[PDB]
Amino acid sequence: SLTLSGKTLFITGASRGIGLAIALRAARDGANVAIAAKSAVANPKLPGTIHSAAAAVNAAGGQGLALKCDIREEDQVRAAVAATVDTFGGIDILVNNASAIWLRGTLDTPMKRFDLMQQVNARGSFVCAQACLPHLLQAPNPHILTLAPPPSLNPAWWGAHTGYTLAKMGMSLVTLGLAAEFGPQGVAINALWPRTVIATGVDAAACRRPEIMADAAHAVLTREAAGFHGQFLIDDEVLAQAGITDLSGYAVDPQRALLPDLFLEEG
Amino acid sequence: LTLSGKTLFITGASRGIGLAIALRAARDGANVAIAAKSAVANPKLPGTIHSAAAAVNAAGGQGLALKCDIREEDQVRAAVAATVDTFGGIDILVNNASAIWLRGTLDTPMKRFDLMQQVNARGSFVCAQACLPHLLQAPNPHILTLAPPPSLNPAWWGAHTGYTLAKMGMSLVTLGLAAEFGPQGVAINALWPRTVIATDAINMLPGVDAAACRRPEIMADAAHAVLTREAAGFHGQFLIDDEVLAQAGITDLSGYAVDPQRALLPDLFLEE
């Protein structure tokens, strides 16, 4: 089987949710995982920290590094990348997972909220790519994997929540540009997005668990990077190609019709 | 088709395209709020909110000089409030903005990335947000953003990702705003020049001589043609100056050339 043994992953926002799931799937292989996230001090209101994540990585079979990194701050990103290189010797894989969401219209989106989304999503992916690339370019099989949808100019999607669509498609379009620039230099710069809503008026019973994205990420990240860039991939399709065709186990409640994810057309 | 008595809020209109738009509207008797950062002049990049407001007055309009850095939400809100207190409303918002940096990602410092996102995409969003409550009450409301048609062309994204994100961001904000508010009868559209336009910003375009450009007045005149259209049923369009002017019966564009002895340079972000 393909493995991330010996590889070093820098994963943003991986104190919880999809980032943590991806971290743990890589850890199972013996990967080094740098958890770069803002949450350091334990808060019951939003459980999970860089430190709990690093411990979970260690318990899952990997080597965890907890890095206090508010990715809105370039200096913290730079410091976290240097720490990762100092601890593990390099960076093989960047996963741009950190994301903030808010589905209201423009008159109902305070600039504080708009700014949080732009800074964490599109800007966070850009600055992390910028900081990691010098090290990625020296690795044997470098990946940047951004958790973002295929780019779209669908006016309905844009009008539905312009602030969030700007920030999330921003991640997609940063991926598009990075892939165009650096893909030809051997870096696999791609995106991965879930078919359904992931449980991390939206009902978790109509969702899938984050392990679908962890397993899909694994399938992408173990691919040869040379010649593999600018792709916008979906979890179910990735897993099918990898030989995982029975997705029933990923369902929170397998008797429920699944909620479709934002930013994918339904055929 | 006149802008007489209409109130325009134009960002960055101390010089260049914004100023030209301001003066074309002034000629009709429009009220123009000049929302820009420069209050006092410097040798390098002339024009201030005060010279622009004075020029609007000289041209036949009513100018209002507003010291406004559009990076600052509080200043934008303050400027919009002052405009309403001065003229009674806002009929037209023109999102005009200049922050360019044509380099690759490793050569695009975060300070420059941030300047671009803040002035371009964010600036358009925050000004739209602040003006919309007033636009929605106006007889013939427009938002006109000076931005290109949205494109997913990978070459354009790869060439200078930070800048493309920022400027396409203005287009994408327009796309979303039009989808949300267009149905309420707000004419939310974009306008982009076929060619490069001669302004201070050509300094950020290596090799580009003003002589191979068009004058800002082509954008001023195309803007006027857009802004005097009925707003109902006219949203989500990404318009080009030459095409707008052709529809308006202006097909001879030769007078808009800076220098007829030079071939015109095609603009960024348009397929040839």
Ligand SMILES: [Ca+2]
């Ligand atoms: Ca919505």
